[PDB]
């Protein structure tokens, strides 16, 4: 999913609905990936980005490879396909012209490029670099680390000088020691690798992060729409 | 303001009101009716005026049975126009009437009331009339 708020990746027991129309992007994937072979997966250096190194035979039975990139940035996520050696983009879900005068570009044929990776140490060092007098440091842990949510930052900052929490949780994640649950702080259902740390919200745990994603998004796809409709009607009634 | 829903030709010749009527010369739906003594064209506005008149006089009274329907249209060119350049546009709708023809009937109501109502209607109509009853 490059759907901006719901952009993610997932494996679902619910094969939702294959369309009646094959769209352009789907057919372009069929052109160059169908019958593929997923040699390797890569994390893109812990940014919210992923890579599939894939192999497949071309139209003459000669084996070829490609690099499928999935950048999940939030409102401006995207899915891109690229050549292995040439690094040239071949396909793109959200073509993005440089009228945004941005660093990178999406369009096919062009040499692929990644976003500007910020100057954040992706993994005590915060007590070195950052002045803990600054306060509201749940904000500025983003300014030091790569993979951060303000949720994660707040729940870790509320553990009260706390480098210990950061190092312990980083070791937890590195060890895959997490617990995929969904948290519900009076609604506003959130979820993350780690459990909830402090807040009053209810928690429901899972065996698979994939099932966590399933049970989350399977409702929120339309629940929020119904809420929009309900509120729009309630305004009028009031 | 009666109307024929649908018509073949929106424009017809006018015609000629010679002779007496074919049918509708005697009351048979109702008891006390009115008939004509001349020939003329009659309009939906005339008939509805007469109708509402008698019904206001009667105020619940029985049944009426008009015996006509303005099938015929009649044209009229716009104002201050030379002759020619096609036939004028339709204006309204008309019923053609021969003498001896019954126009309105009445039942469910006494003779005096009927005669007075039909008098009132006759004064809304252009033509000479007669009060009639069933045999």
């Amino acid at each position: 999913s490059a759907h901006p708020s719901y952009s993610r990746v997932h494996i679902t027991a619910q094969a939702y609905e294959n369309p009646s129309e094959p769209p352009m992007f789907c057919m372009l994937l069929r052109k160059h990936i169908e019958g593929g072979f997923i040699e390797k997966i890569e994390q893109a250096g812990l940014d919210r980005i992923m890579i599939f190194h894939i192999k497949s035979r071309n139209e003459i039975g000669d084996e070829t490879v490609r690099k499928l990139y999935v950048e999940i940035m939030g409102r401006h996520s995207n899915i891109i396909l690229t050549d292995a050696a040439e690094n040239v983009i071949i396909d793109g879900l959200k073509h993005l012209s440089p009228s945004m005068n941005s660093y990178r570009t999406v369009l096919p044929g062009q040499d692929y490029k990644l976003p500007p990776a910020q100057d954040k140490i992706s993994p005590d060092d915060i007590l070195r670099h950052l002045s803990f007098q600054e306060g509201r440091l749940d904000k500025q842990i983003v300014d030091h680390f790569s993979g951060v949510s303000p949720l994660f930052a707040k729940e870790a900052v509320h553990r009260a000088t706390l480098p210990k929490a950061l190092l312990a949780l980083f070791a937890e994640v590195k060890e895959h020691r997490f617990i995929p649950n969904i948290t519900t702080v009076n609604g506003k259902e959130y979820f993350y690798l780690l459990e909830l740390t402090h807040l009053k919200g209810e928690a429901r745990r899972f065996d698979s992060l994939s099932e966590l994603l399933d049970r989350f998004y399977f409702g929120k796809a339309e629940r929020d729409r119904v809420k929009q409709q309900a509120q729009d009607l309630e305004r009028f009634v009031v | 303001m009666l109307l024929p829903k649908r018509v073949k030709y929106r424009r017809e010749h006018r015609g000629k009101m010679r002779g007496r009527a074919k049918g509708g010369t005697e009351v048979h739906f109702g008891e006390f009716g009115i008939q004509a003594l001349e020939a003329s064209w009659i309009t939906n506005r005339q008939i509805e005026a007469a109708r509402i008149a008698m019904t206001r006089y009667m105020k619940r009274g029985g049944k009426v049975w008009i015996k006509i329907f303005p099938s015929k249209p009649y044209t009229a060119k716009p104002l201050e126009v030379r002759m020619g350049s096609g036939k004028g546009a339709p204006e309204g709708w008309v019923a053609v009437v021969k003498p001896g023809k019954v126009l309105f009937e009445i039942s469910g109501v006494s003779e005096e009331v009927a005669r007075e109502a039909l008098r009132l209607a006759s004064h809304k109509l252009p033509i000479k009339t007669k009060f009639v009853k069933r045999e």
Binding site: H95, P98, S99, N101, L107, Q110 | -
Partner: protein
């Protein structure tokens, strides 16, 4: 067709107004020649453009007016970028 219309349909620029604005600034050019929003275009045209310092060179493949979104970029190809 016209340059501004072409840019909008190809979704290089989101507003024909903005296309006109930049062409009136003369930030861009065609075939080495300074151009205007009313400038005629065609397939095979070589187009120089500026976005601040970002200079761009592209090539015109097609042109139309109905231009749904993803089919827009088929209309042309990038060639080169400088600054």
């Amino acid at each position: 067709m016209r340059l501004d219309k072409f840019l909008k349909v190809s979704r290089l620029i989101k507003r024909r107004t903005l296309a006109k604005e930049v062409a009136d600034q003369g930030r861009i050019s065609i075939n080495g020649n300074q151009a205007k929003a009313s400038s005629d275009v065609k397939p095979g045209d070589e187009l120089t453009v500026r976005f601040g310092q970002k200079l761009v060179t592209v090539q015109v493949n097609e042109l139309k007016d109905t231009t749904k979104k993803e089919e827009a970029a088929n209309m042309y190809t990038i060639l080169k970028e400088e600054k």
